Design goal:
It is classed as cytosolic protein. Keywords: Assembly, Intermediate, Complex, cytosolic protein. Structure of recombinant human gamma-Tubulin Ring Complex without actin. Chain A: Gamma-tubulin complex component 4. This is part of a larger assembly, with chains A (about 375 residues), B (about 425 residues) and C (about 220 residues). Helices cover about 65% and strands about 0% of the residues of chain A. The longest helix of chain A is centred in the C-terminal third of the chain and has 40 residues. With about 375 residues, chain A is mostly helical. Chain B has about 425 residues and is an alpha/beta fold. In chain B, helix 6 crosses helix 13 and helix 7 crosses helix 8. Chain C is mainly alpha-helical. Chain C has 11 helices and no strands. Classes of the chains: A mainly alpha (about 375), B alpha/beta (about 425), C mainly alpha (about 220).
């Protein structure tokens, strides 16, 4: 009821957010771990919201109840659990109210989707277009400010002008342990929501941002080469066929990602608006992260070792074709044939791997085998 | 990014007028441009944030023998768009020659609006094929745009000239314009006038005001196609991404129009998918096989519905396949627009590259071949004679459209390592 | 109390209702489309003689009352039913002279009466008593036992337990009579066979497993 103890080199089975944990050994064998976690939750929560707000005052009523338990022998778990959960319910409603209301969580989820998960197509596309040379160049310290002010200028360019929670966004080009390789995005977190956003969840958000931005970057420049040549040989028309041919499977990859983002984010937001429990919000974030980490298929190495190549081949093709609009008989054919055969190999391999069995994975196959050229494989 | 829309000819200014009125009613603006209180969106795709708090669209107003453009002038939607660039028939040669002699200042008008917006994605041409007023000038301006700017996209919303029709030079005009369309455009959206006429005489019992109702249809299609650009999604927030999948090669860039309600005057994704795949919910009416289809849906879509609908579409095989590769109907999801009428809450449209349009092309080629063999239907137009005394451009256009038909039939084959 | 909260969540009656509906209207249509092969073809038709795959998992508190070797028995009765429906639809798809049609009646009546027997007198009579028994079981233990003594008597009445060389073979050969009559539409040499095998069935079934006499007089 306070977060104060008076032990002198002894234990009472407990060891802001300082020296609070329970160990299984010191906790008695006839008292379970279940009620002990409720006790620990009460102590930590009350300690957190008690200071810097300068909170609840039912401490004396609860203390009289506990003291009555002390007077009447001996131990029987049902009375102890009833009084501990009676504290727990009031503590949990209090704590939930503070964290959700004094700082809004809903706006945070909107911003995180809008930027980490590429929820602004025009802003991010204009950012790829404008900051091309900046992000292309190898890492150094001072490019991070340039890419940040370009990224802010695009936010004003689309005509959504808004101060506050836009300056909290940054593009971090780190240096000393092409600039796309060390590229990151960061976001700041307030004091009531501080425990909810710990380094792990934002660490995963950064990796998702890198994956989606890589495929979105690939798409536009492949297409620029294609449209440049389209506006104008046997060598010529082969390349436009090839441009289209790569764009297809790449676009389908990004669409499978679009599918999981919509489906899982709806559950997360809807669970947050419909609960008054602190623990259930933690569990909602757990489910969101685990599903997303699975659906990227970064856990399994071979399909990852293929999607990297799907981006890579387009990079090489785009750099080779853009030099001369006229035909390349300067070993252009040597790489062009290898490119189409290796694209067949990699697209077939990822198709095979994508072939428990989550639904979304399953019908992503069922686009191309409508039109039957992996029915022949 | 940002789209600058070009309108020319009486039919083109008609469809641009109805499209601008449709986007005015759609977004939160008055016919003056006054901001509303209900407006994930974007108002910078067709609209400049212009300098009297009216989101004035970047539109090039071109007039040639203006009759309906005068009615566009005295209108409440003339307070929405007028950057004051209006500058002045029944033939392709006349419109071509008239556009030729004054290309400079209208190119300066294009340059003014090109300097007007910060970014650019493409040029959408409100055009009518063999419409007389739009014809010739549209083909010449298409040559000017694709030559002057090779780094941008050119789109041409086009009708197919069959209105149950007297003009006998119309196959020559459509043939020359189609030569320009194949050679000087990145993508062409084609519709059939007879198909929309059949659909309009079906859904209502109108016979006389067919033009205005067709205008409603094309404006709704044009809003529906750029909804994914005007409202931020994940893909096709630029034109070139939507243009990319349907077009496999620079010669096959002609796209069929579909939209699954023919009605706006309960539903699931599964039913509207199977309702979309028939060729009589297509608004464009041997082995005929699509190259690539793309469908975009807007509504209260359960995300599992598109998944099992695409399952059903696969094992039913109700879509025409591509031999040489995979390129299939792609499910895209878009946001339901504010202030649209609440009928067909789940509504989808499709754009598709089909080889069946080769049949319509060779029909018009057969009409041209008939009138050209008879040699009594050039009518001796003086601009046609003075433009080309030898009329070799008709032969060149015939050769180009023949190569186009051969490439269509070659793409139909399981081998497209055989060309034309 | 345990049996009450087993029929309010993790309802065994729900899985039971699904079970005996995944054999025997809807599953007719599914198999008749197969009449006009491959194991992945069946998955995609399903999601839209004998044969198909029959499987669904039981949640673990009802997986301690429904065995894994109980699923195999569900499949056995499924197989026997599919052969009858196949023979019935082969004899009911056809649009000499009018003489073929007497041969149609001469066989179609026999399979139809047998179908009526197999469903009604066993699989629905014994099912209707069995439901009234399980809704008054308040014990874990007896619930397995009434179920095993429900399957093992339907498995006796529709016999598969032993004497499949004197009952099963007759049904198997009249399945080939279905094929032979299906092709022709010689003809007279089929009822000479049918009258032989029918009387062989009767002259074997005249000694009795005891429930077989209910058709041997029809």
């Amino acid at each position: 009821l306070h977060g104060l103890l008076l032990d002198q080199h002894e234990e009472f089975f407990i060891k802001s957010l300082k020296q609070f944990s329970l160990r299984v050994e010191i906790l008695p064998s006839y008292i379970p771990v279940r009620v002990a976690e409720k006790i620990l939750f009460v102590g930590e929560s009350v300690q957190m919201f008690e200071n810097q707000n300068v909170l609840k005052n039912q401490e004396d009523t609860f203390a009289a109840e506990l003291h009555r338990l002390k007077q009447q022998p001996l131990f029987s778990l049902v009375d102890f659990e009833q009084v501990v959960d009676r504290i727990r319910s009031t503590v949990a409603e209090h704590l939930w109210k503070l964290m959700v209301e004094e700082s809004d969580l809903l706006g945070q989820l909107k911003i995180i989707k809008d930027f980490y998960l590429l929820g602004r197509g025009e802003l991010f596309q204009a950012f790829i277009d404008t900051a091309q040379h900046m992000l292309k160049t190898p890492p150094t310290a001072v490019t991070e400010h340039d890419v940040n002010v370009a990224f802010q200028q695009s936010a004003h360019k689309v005509l959504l002008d808004d101060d506050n929670l836009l300056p909290l966004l940054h593009l971090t080009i780190e240096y000393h342990g092409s600039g796309w390789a060390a590229l990151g995005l960061s976001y700041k977190v307030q004091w009531p929501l501080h425990i909810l956003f710990t380094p792990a969840v934002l660490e995963k958000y950064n990796v998702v941002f890198k994956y989606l931005l890589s495929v979105r970057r690939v798409q536009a420049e492949l297409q620029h080469c294609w449209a440049l040549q389209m506006q104008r040989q046997t060598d010529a028309i082969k390349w436009r066929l090839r441009n289209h041919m790569a764009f297809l499977v790449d676009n389908l990859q990004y669409y499978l990602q679009v599918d999981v983002l919509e489906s899982q984010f709806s559950q997360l937001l809807h669970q947050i608006n419909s609960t008054r429990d602190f623990e259930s919000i933690r569990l909602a974030h757990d489910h969101f992260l685990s599903n997303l980490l699975a659906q990227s298929f970064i856990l399994l190495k071979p399909v990852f070792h293929c999607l990297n190549e799907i981006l890579d081949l387009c990079h090489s093709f785009c750099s080779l074709v853009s030099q001369n609009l006229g035909p390349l008989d300067e070993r252009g054919a040597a790489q062009l044939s290898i490119l189409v055969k290796g694209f067949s190999r990699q697209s077939s391999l990822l198709f095979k791997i994508l072939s428990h069995q989550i639904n979304s994975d399953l019908a992503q196959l069922l686009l191309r085998l409508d039109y039957n050229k992996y029915y022949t494989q | 990014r940002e789209i600058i829309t070009l309108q020319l000819g009486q039919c083109g200014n008609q469809i641009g007028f109805e499209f601008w009125k449709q986007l005015c009613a759609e977004h939160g603006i008055s016919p003056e441009g006054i901001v509303e209180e209900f407006a994930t969106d974007r108002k910078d795709v067709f609209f400049y944030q212009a300098d009297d708090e009216h989101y004035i669209p970047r539109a090039v107003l071109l007039d040639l023998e203006p009759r309906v453009i005068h009615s566009i002038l005295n209108s409440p939607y003339a307070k929405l768009y007028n950057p004051e660039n209006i500058y002045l028939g029944n033939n392709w040669a006349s419109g071509f020659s008239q556009g030729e002699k004054i290309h400079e200042d209208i190119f300066d008008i294009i340059d003014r609006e090109a300097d007007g917006s910060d970014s650019l994605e493409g040029f959408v041409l409100c055009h009518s094929i063999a419409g007389g007023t739009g014809s010739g000038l549209g083909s010449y301006l298409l040559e000017r745009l694709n030559d002057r700017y090779p780094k941008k996209l050119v789109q041409t919303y086009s009708v197919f000239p069959n209105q149950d029709e007297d003009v006998v030079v119309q196959p020559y005009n459509s043939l020359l314009t189609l030569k320009r369309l194949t050679q000087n455009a990145d993508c062409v959206v084609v519709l059939d006038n007879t198909a929309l006429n059949r659909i309009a005489t079906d859904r209502l019992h109108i016979q006389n005001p067919s033009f205005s109702q067709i205008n409603q249809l094309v404006s709704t299609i044009m809003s529906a196609s750029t909804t994914t650009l005007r409202y931020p999604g994940y893909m096709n927030n630029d034109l070139i991404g939507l243009i990319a999948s349907l077009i496999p090669t620079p010669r096959l860039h002609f796209l069929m129009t579909g939209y699954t309600p023919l009605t706006t005057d309960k539903t699931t994704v599964l039913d509207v998918m199977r309702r979309l795949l028939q060729p009589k919910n297509v608004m464009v009416s041997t082995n005929h096989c699509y190259i690539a289809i793309l469908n975009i849906i807007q509504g209260e879509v359960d995300p599992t519905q598109v998944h099992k609908s695409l399952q059903r579409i696969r094992e039913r095989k109700l879509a025409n396949f591509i031999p040489w590769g995979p390129a299939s109907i792609q499910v895209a999801l878009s946001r339901k627009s504010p202030y649209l009428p609440s009928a067909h809450r789940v509504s989808g449209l499709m754009m598709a590259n089909h080889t069946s349009i080769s049949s319509l092309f060779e029909r018009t080629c057969r009409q041209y071949d008939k009138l050209r063999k008879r040699e009594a239907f050039l009518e001796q137009f003086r601009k046609e004679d003075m433009f080309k005394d030898n009329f070799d451009e008709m032969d060149t256009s015939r050769e180009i459209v023949q190569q186009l038909i051969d490439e269509y039939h070659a793409a139909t084959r399981p081998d497209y390592i055989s060309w034309g | 109390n345990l049996m009450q909260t087993l029929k309010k969540d993790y309802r065994l009656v729900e899985y039971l209702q699904a079970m005996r509906n995944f054999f025997l209207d809807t599953m007719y249509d599914f198999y008749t489309s197969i009449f006009d092969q491959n194991v992945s073809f069946l998955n995609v038709q399903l999601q839209e003689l004998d044969g198909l795959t029959l499987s669904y998992k039981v949640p673990w508190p009802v997986d301690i009352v429904i065995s894994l070797e109980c699923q195999k028995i569900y499949n056995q009765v499924f197989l026997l039913l599919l052969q009858i429906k196949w023979a019935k639809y082969s004899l009911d798809v056809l649009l000499q002279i009018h003489r073929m049609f007497l041969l149609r009646v001469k066989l179609m009546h026999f399979v139809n009466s047998l179908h009526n027997y197999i469903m009604t007198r066993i699989l629905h009579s014994t099912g209707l008593e069995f439901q009234h028994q399980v809704e008054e079981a308040k014990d874990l233990d007896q619930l397995i036992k009434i179920h095993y003594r429900y399957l093992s008597t339907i498995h006796d009445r529709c016999l598969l337990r032993e004497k499949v060389s004197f009952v099963k073979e007759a049904i198997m050969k009249v399945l080939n009579l279905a094929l032979m009559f299906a092709d022709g539409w010689s003809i007279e040499k089929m009822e000479s066979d049918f009258k032989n095998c029918h009387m062989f069935l009767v002259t074997i079934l005249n000694k009795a497993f005891p429930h077989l006499e209910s058709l041997a007089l029809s």
